[PDB]
Amino acid sequence: DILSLKEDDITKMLVATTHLGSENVNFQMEQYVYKRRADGVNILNLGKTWEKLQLAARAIVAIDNPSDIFVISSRPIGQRAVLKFAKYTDTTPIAGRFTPGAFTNQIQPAFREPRLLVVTDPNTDHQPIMEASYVNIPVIAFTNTDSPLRYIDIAIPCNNKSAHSIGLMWWLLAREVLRLRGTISRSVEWPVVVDLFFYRDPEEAEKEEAAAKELLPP
Amino acid sequence: TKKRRNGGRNKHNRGHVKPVRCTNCARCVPKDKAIKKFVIRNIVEAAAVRDITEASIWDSYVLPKLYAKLHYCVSCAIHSKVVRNRSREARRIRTPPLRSFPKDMAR
Amino acid sequence: EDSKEWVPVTKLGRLVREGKIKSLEEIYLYSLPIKEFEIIDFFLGSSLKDEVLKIMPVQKQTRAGQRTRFKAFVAIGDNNGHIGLGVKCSKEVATAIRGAIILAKLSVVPVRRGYWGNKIGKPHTVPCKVTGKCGSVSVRLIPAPRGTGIVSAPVPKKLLTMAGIEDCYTSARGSTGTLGNFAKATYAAIAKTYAYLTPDLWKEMPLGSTPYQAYSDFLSKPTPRLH
Amino acid sequence: MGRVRTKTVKKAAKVIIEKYYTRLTLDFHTNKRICEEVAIIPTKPLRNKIAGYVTHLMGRLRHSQVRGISIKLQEEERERRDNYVPAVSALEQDIIEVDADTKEMLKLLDFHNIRGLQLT
Amino acid sequence: VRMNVLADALKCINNAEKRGKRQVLLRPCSKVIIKFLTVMMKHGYIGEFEIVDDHRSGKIVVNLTGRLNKCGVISPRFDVPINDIEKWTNNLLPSRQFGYVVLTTSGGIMDHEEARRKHLGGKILGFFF
Amino acid sequence: MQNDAGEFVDLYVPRKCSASNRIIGAKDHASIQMNVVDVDPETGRQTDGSKTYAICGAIRRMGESDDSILRLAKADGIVSKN
RNA sequence: GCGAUCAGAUACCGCCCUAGUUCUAACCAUAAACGAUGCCAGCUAGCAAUUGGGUGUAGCUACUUUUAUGGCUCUCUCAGUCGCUUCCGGGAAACCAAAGCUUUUUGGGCUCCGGGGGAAGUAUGGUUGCAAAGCUGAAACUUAAAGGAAUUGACGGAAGGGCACC
RNA sequence: CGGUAAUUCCAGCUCCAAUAGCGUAUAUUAAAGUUGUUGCGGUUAAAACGUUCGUAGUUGAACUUGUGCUUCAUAC
């Protein structure tokens, strides 16, 4: 049905190399890895990791404040997606530094009090995950094979080292947050592109203008 | 108060391991507890190469090097400062550092 | 005179000042971070007595020549079923105990008091036997029938006269002169009593309201509603 | 080198520049003139410092401005730097690239028999 | 040598209870083991356990629930009359309320709260709470 | 807990861990109420009616509470066709 | 035994060498004989190597040939060993995958050993040895501490930095 | 503590504890999980024989009549 897999998306999922998993597997994560090629290409299940999204989607709703879901990233290749992910939903974008600890805050009258941390990588963004260990926080992490799972529920096994994978899944999150009482008229094709959560180029940004207006004089 | 996981150095299931005379105090220190340094050093040291290759006969000949595996007592490589005094969290490392360049004294 | 009404800082103490939670064990129900003592000044404060146990001085050797700072203990307990423990070092004895009584209030935890052998009339001692070790002292709390009061050293008898535990048997091993490790050993034994799955607790709950769900509107509003 | 800048000249250089970069010049001698306006000072050698430092960094915001500053004019350009460049998509339109063992996973799981071809 | 064969099911149940496992593979299945877990099964401290048979000694796969804390085994089997049966229920059992001391009396393996009803005395086996 | 004259006497009842049955200690700060909400089976249309899950620190500190959701997910049938 | 060195130097440094070192024949029976960790059994987690042996290449490669013996790589498994990572176990801690499951007055068997510090491994008896010595082995008396691990005091005669004409 | 303003000494005033009872000695028991079967400890605090073999002794896996089937007395 509509909540099922909808294999037009796997045509795009091959593009972001989600099949490509890392070499080292970490037995918690082995439940998602389908199999391995010779010499280190651990191919994960693609319908498991798609079923995690709607499981993540069935989780991300029933948080009546869309403010109180802290999307975070530390890596800059995970940063252009994540602040642009908070454009449509009303989540709070946390790009880069956290200033540990956020926990007796400075100027803000209300607290920077999250209620569902979600994080592009459990390895490198390890700091507020173990700081989500104090204030009763469910943490969804986009994972590879080699990942910690300490204080993680749930994991989403994608690739999490290419620019395109994190570029994809935040758009894959962007659908199902809006398909499920987010009023996008029940999974129609998208007015927003599925590639805006990408580096237009790796930094430094070459002179690719807004909608690429080309120079008539040299 | 035990200072090292391995105590002195590296004696795993042998019971007892042979000694070696230290290179410059001739102290009987064992083989695994021996600061082994292994030099491959040029024979002219880098400034007579531009002087030998004048008076070379051949097409630069290229000159040989030395090959010796020097052992050190633990004092006679703290005094020579081959090896010093790492921190308590850096007594636990074996693998870094060079981190800068190819290492000199070869060269 | 207050004289200063406490500011809601976290989202939790927002609700008790706005009165959306009126039961103390609700934060115990979901094991919340109770990180303002101004929370427990609302629910309790009526019948919350402070007792100190020691004002143990402690010193450091600077180059000329010593410097003393004061690890004052304090112990607060509502006289039936809540207990706390407070320890802090500062440059004056007043600025320890004016702030130690804070640090006991933040860690105030609920006691399970259980019938010893015959369930009649407001259970008193302890449901099971519990050991709390904090560094080589380990007090081993044990039930006792009605009317035999708290038999212990005089220090954790004060930890149990203020806990609501009525008739308890104790036995403490180790260096029982270290008062920090003898208060905290019992504190880590009293507080245990609700962390032990007695067979009375098998049928579960409807399993949740999680009051950030139950009151998601008042935290959605940014307007600081009064009262 | 040896004339480093203290806190007050550093912690005021930001708070005037991210506010009053507009109607501000590069000319230090008139940048001397504007510090008495947008803030107050008790003494003139501090305006020799707190105008000298902002002008020793004023051209630097043109050429790759450092962190810790928000000029309020680059971020509105960063909306256009949030450009969708058309039209990057599936590259070989399916893509036909498959690891030749997960082609089974494109069949045992996916009913799409679409052209994902073996490349070794 | 594998001395006490009751004992290290109970240190494989208790050991695998602490880490919170759900199924436990004992080896090698005494008929004092099965009589013990059936005493732990009438009180629900254990799942339904299946005895995967070999022609060697037996192996049990036990389902765990998560209701118990400690199953131990009193070695040696001290001879426990009825009169000093109360001595042990103070010691091994953490409250007068719950908990059980399994003992082998001659009228079949029962816990103390049956043998103090059937007025039997025996030798002690283990306990659980 | 309850005495003879039908009274849940002392203070409260703690939630148990929905994964492996253990208690939620009254200071457990790696605790959780995980409210997964259901959905209309036709298309989109999140319905009311969640599934509340409680997961202790002792399980999450292992890291074995990604999959221990899935068992509570599958037995409740919320994640489907597994 | 010299030569120095030093206030002295029966020492370190320097030279000469003797017993010894070495081989068979015996004696001695000790060592920081250390993993300062008895032994047999079960359990409780990763990850990386890694010595043997097994096994699958749905691997390469050797050329004797595409081969086949040989090598390598990949996969699995015993018997392990060594490291790290951590407890989400213990500990006074330093730490330990056992120094854990020694739980709440705990129980897989078995043996050896300890009871404040000295006196003292002494005195004396027995027993072994060519002897040196080994095993056994006290007390009178003395005494309030002696000890373990860790913190903070020396950018006080130790490394690595960084200043100034007290 | 006392080494020339003694909260301990000699006193005086005071004050406390028990009270027809109170102090002192040696003995003994509990404190002592500091003799420990219940119940100690042995990497570093005292403490695992240098090693293995081995009688005494201690301790030794599994398996060999078990619930069924019908009734009543019997909780409801």
Swiss-Prot record, chain C:
Name of the protein described by the UniProt record: Small ribosomal subunit protein uS5
Function text: Component of the ribosome, a large ribonucleoprotein complex responsible for the synthesis of proteins in the cell. The small ribosomal subunit (SSU) binds messenger RNAs (mRNAs) and translates the encoded message by selecting cognate aminoacyl-transfer RNA (tRNA) molecules. The large subunit (LSU) contains the ribosomal catalytic site termed the peptidyl transferase center (PTC), which catalyzes the formation of peptide bonds, thereby polymerizing the amino acids delivered by tRNAs into a polypeptide chain.
Family: Belongs to the universal ribosomal protein uS5 family.
Annotated GO biological process: cytoplasmic translation; oogenesis; translation
UniProt entry keywords in alphabetical sequence: Developmental protein, Differentiation, Oogenesis, Phosphoprotein, Ribonucleoprotein, Ribosomal protein
Organism: Drosophila melanogaster (Fruit fly)
Domain S5 DRBM intervals: 48-111
Taxonomic lineage: Eukaryota, Metazoa, Ecdysozoa, Arthropoda, Hexapoda
SUPFAM superfamilies: dsRNA-binding domain-like (SSF54768), Ribosomal protein S5 domain 2-like (SSF54211)
From Swiss-Prot, chain D:
GO molecular function: structural constituent of ribosome
Single GO biological process annotation from the record: cytoplasmic translation
Keyword NADP: no
Keywords, alphabetical: Ribonucleoprotein, Ribosomal protein
Any one GO CC term of the record: cytosolic small ribosomal subunit
InterPro entries: Ribosomal_eS17, Ribosomal_eS17_CS, Ribosomal_eS17_sf
PROSITE patterns reported for this sequence: RIBOSOMAL_S17E
Keyword GTP-binding: no
Family: Belongs to the eukaryotic ribosomal protein eS17 family.
Protein name according to UniProt: Small ribosomal subunit protein eS17
Organism: Drosophila melanogaster
Lineage, highest ranks first: Eukaryota, Metazoa, Ecdysozoa, Arthropoda, Hexapoda
Name of the gene encoding the protein in the UniProt record: RpS17
Swiss-Prot record, chain E:
Short name of one Pfam family: Ribosomal_S8
InterPro entries: Ribosomal_uS8 (IPR000630), Ribosomal_uS8_CS (IPR047863), Ribosomal_uS8_sf (IPR035987)
Keywords (A to Z) from UniProt: Ribonucleoprotein, Ribosomal protein
Transmembrane regions listed in the UniProt entry: none
Recorded GO MF terms: structural constituent of ribosome
GO biological process, one term: cytoplasmic translation
Signal peptide start and end residues: none
GO CC annotation terms, alphabetical: cytosolic ribosome; cytosolic small ribosomal subunit
Ribosomal protein as UniProt keyword: yes
Family: Belongs to the universal ribosomal protein uS8 family.
Protein name per the record: Small ribosomal subunit protein uS8A
Organism from which the protein derives: Drosophila melanogaster (Fruit fly)
Curated annotation (Swiss-Prot), chain F:
GO cellular component, one term: ribosome
MF GO annotations: ribosome binding; structural constituent of ribosome
Keyword rRNA processing attached: yes
One BP term from GO: regulation of cell population proliferation
Pfam family, one: Ribosomal_S21e
Primary location class: cytoplasm
Gene3D superfamilies associated with the record: 3.30.1230.20
Keywords: Cytoplasm, Developmental protein, Endoplasmic reticulum, Ribonucleoprotein, Ribosomal protein, rRNA processing, Translation regulation
Compartment(s): Cytoplasm, Cytosol; Cytoplasm; Rough endoplasmic reticulum
Role according to the record: May be an associated component of the ribosome rather than a core structural subunit. May act as a translation initiation factor. Has a role in regulation of cell proliferation in the hematopoietic organs and the imaginal disks of larva.
Subunit structure: Component of the 40S small ribosomal subunit. Interacts with sta.
Family: Belongs to the eukaryotic ribosomal protein eS21 family.
Name the record gives this protein: Small ribosomal subunit protein eS21
